[PDB]
Amino acid sequence: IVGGYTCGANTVPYQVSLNSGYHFCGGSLINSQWVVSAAHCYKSGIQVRLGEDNINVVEGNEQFISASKSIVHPSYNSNTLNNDIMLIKLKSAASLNSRVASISLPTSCASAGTQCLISGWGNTKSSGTSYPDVLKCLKAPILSDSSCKSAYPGQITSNMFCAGYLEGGKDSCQGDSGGPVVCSGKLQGIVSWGSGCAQKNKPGVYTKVCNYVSWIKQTIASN
């Protein structure tokens, strides 16, 4: 996160770290055995880490659970990043409490102007790499489709939305991929891509979760 602040230990209880010997993406806990992330974060050998704050130290509250299966959306296109969503089933259910909790799926899409919280252990510099130890947060508004599309002409599909600041300085970045964009207590986005990080007129692009609520439910129900 660039231009973000320290969230505070466990203040974001649905945030998970996807790890394979190092943190590479984020994800959101939606129920004791399922997490939602970005299809582009897929790999084998993923251990899901819950109750994390500082990713390099064990401080208590952490639950490390291996992933049983990752389900990349059947229509994910790695060249356009359209349908950039994946579901991971955990080997065992997580113990939920106030430090580890799931987040709710939306009943409706959100509108431009809605303020959302984005979190992650991704890069904090726009020019260079600086990865934090603790979880960073950023409050960002969903942008209008005309501003999104004027920013990335021909690259936005209807399963994407832009959120951020066109002046630059505050944005999500690499390492945050796969994680949550929560608005009014509902998971509305998944960190997906953008051009550089916190650059002027290049806001972040997120996977529009409201368009997959039925797919997520049908898939969890059949697995």
Ligand X SMILES: NC(=[NH2+])c1ccc2[nH]c(-c3cccc(OC4CCCC4)c3[O-])cc2c1
Residues forming the active site = 40, 84, 177
Half-sphere exposure of 56 (CA within 13 A, CB side): 5
Selection from ligand X, Ca ion, none that 7 binds (CB < 5 to 8 A by kind) is none
**DSSP code at position 93:** P
User: Based on CB atoms, which residue is closest to ligand X, 200 or 217?
Assistant: 200
Burial of 134 (0-12, 13-18, 19+ CB in 10 A): middle
Question: Least distance from C-beta 182 to ligand X, angstroms?
Answer: 16
User: Based on CB atoms, which residue is closest to Ca ion, 19 or 80?
Assistant: 19
The answer to whether 174 is a known ligand-binding residue is yes
Selection from Ca ion, ligand X, none that 54 binds (CB < 5 to 8 A by kind) is Ca ion
Tokens for 189? 């986005």
Distance CA 198, CA 127 (A): 9
Selection from Ca ion, ligand X, none that 207 binds (CB < 5 to 8 A by kind) is none
Is residue 61 a contact residue for Ca ion (CB under 5 A)?
no
Question: Least distance from C-beta 137 to Ca ion, angstroms?
Answer: 17
Question: Least distance from C-beta 156 to ligand X, angstroms?
Answer: 13
The answer to whether 54 is a known ligand-binding residue is yes
Selection from Ca ion, ligand X, none that 187 binds (CB < 5 to 8 A by kind) is none
Angle at 186 between CA 147 and CA 69, to 5 degrees: 100
Is residue 211 a contact residue for Ca ion (CB under 5 A)?
no
Tokens for 140? 């960002």
The answer to whether 175 is a known ligand-binding residue is yes
User: Based on CB atoms, which residue is closest to ligand X, 56 or 214?
Assistant: 56
Residues that bind ligand X (CB under 6 A): 24-25, 40-41, 171-174, 176-177, 191, 193-194, 197, 204
Burial 84-122 (b: 16+ CB within 10 A, else e): bbbbbbbeeebebeebbebbebbeebbeeebebbbbbbb
The answer to whether 56 is a known ligand-binding residue is no
Of 170, 180, 175, 174, nearest in space to 206 by CA? 180
The answer to whether 179 is a known ligand-binding residue is no
> With contact defined as beta carbons under 8 Å apart, do 72 and 82 qualify?
no
Known binding-site positions for Ca(2+) = 52, 54, 57, 62
Known binding-site positions for substrate = 171-172, 174-175, 177
Interface with Ca ion by CB under 5 A: which residues? 52, 54, 57
